[PDB]
Design a protein around this ligand. Structure first.
Ligand code: HEM
Ligand SMILES: [Ca+2]
Ligand SMILES: [Ca+2]
Length: 315
């Protein structure tokens, strides 16, 4: 199909996304940058989608975190999410797509601004949410590995899919974990979607970048990085450590698995065969240019190797 402005897309119903793409890139992502607003919109896709429990309810990726923001932004695991919900709500009011479609579309358009990124498959047509998420369904950084794996498993993700989705923390920072140092990233390249997150969480912890006593925070290996306790333990736990190390210096696997598992997450609560594929509307991301590496001056002796089957790669 050819849209009114001459841009093409495989399914004509997808044309309504083009003005929305332009508005988002200009006015949500500040001129298509891979910066805070993209990182916050990617976090929003997961805090929306993960509100899905077979035994309790919630409609998954349904826009409920915007539609029922008064409720869901009260949940402590949604701390800081109110800023991006407030930023996105007027786009939803202005355009003619549901909040659940908008959240997944904005997250996919944002990831496409980041070098190394992928185009996450994107489907159009989610109905408006009809219920708020239940409470207590979003994992937090102080939760055990078994707790996080049980919650994610209850929403349909295996432990390896958990590790694949946490490639998101390659373009990510924390504002509430240590409020003295907001914006401190989880890897050294928070504007590049790459394997540095899986490398750097494997280093021995050395210091706290801000204060020392924050719930959910582990020691970091670098003054300009923060480390969540959840990530510290997942990189080391026998249930997930081999998969975590398998992502290091493995950008093709990060790309393929993140796109696929993001698509699975964007469809929680939904039925792909009822929606229209509009994947080809997402921009083409830039590619990586620089090789994966340990931080300069570090060596294998600084890595806490946690996979008995396979030594950490010589980078
Ligand atoms: C698996 C368990 C997870 C835990 C415990 C966890 C925890 C956290 C925490 C504590 C923050 C910092 C919030 C702040 O203090 O500002 C964060 C940020 C973020 N998380 Fe995760 N997360 C998890 C999974 C995921 C997943 C599956 C995604 C996929 C989209 C995601 C994407 C993000 C992003 C992109 C940010 C950065 C937000 C920003 O820089 O504005 N997280 N996460
Ligand atoms: Ca939801
Ligand atoms: Ca990165």
């Amino acid at each position: 199909a050819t849209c009114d402005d001459g841009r093409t897309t495989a399914n004509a119903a997808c044309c309504i996304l083009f003005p929305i793409l332009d508005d988002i890139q200009e006015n949500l992502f500040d001129g298509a940058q891979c910066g805070e607003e993209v990182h916050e919109s990617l976090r929003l896709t997961f805090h929306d989608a993960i509100g899905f429990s077979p035994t309790l309810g919630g409609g998954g990726a349904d826009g409920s975190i915007i539609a029922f923001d008064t409720i869901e932004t009260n949940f402590p695991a949604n701390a800081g999410i109110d800023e991006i919900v407030s930023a996105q709500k007027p786009f939803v009011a202005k355009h003619n797509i549901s909040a659940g479609d908008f959240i997944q579309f904005a997250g996919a358009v944002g990831v496409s601004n980041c070098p190394g990124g992928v185009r996450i498959p994107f489907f159009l047509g989610r109905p408006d949410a009809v219920a708020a998420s239940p409470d207590h369904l979003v994992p937090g950084p102080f939760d055990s590995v078994d707790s996080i794996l049980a919650r994610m498993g209850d929403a349909g993700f295996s432990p390896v899919e958990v590790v694949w989705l946490l490639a998101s923390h390659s373009i990510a920072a924390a504002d509430k974990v240590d409020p003295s140092i907001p914006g401190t990233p989880f890897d050294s390249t928070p504007e590049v979607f790459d394997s540095q997150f899986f490398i750097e969480t494997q280093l021995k912890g050395r210091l706290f970048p801000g204060t020392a006593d924050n719930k959910g925070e582990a020691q970091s290996p670098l003054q300009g990085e923060i480390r969540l306790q959840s990530d510290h333990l997942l990189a080391r736990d026998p249930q997930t450590a081999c998969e975590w190390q398998s992502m290091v210096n493995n950008q093709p696997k990060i790309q393929n698995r993140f796109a696929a598992t993001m698509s699975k997450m964007a469809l929680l609560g939904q039925d792909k065969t009822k929606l229209i594929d509009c994947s080809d509307v997402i921009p083409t991301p830039p590619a990586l240019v620089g090789a994966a590496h340990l931080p300069a001056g570090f060596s294998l002796s600084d890595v806490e190797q946690a996979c008995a089957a396979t030594p950490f790669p010589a980078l």
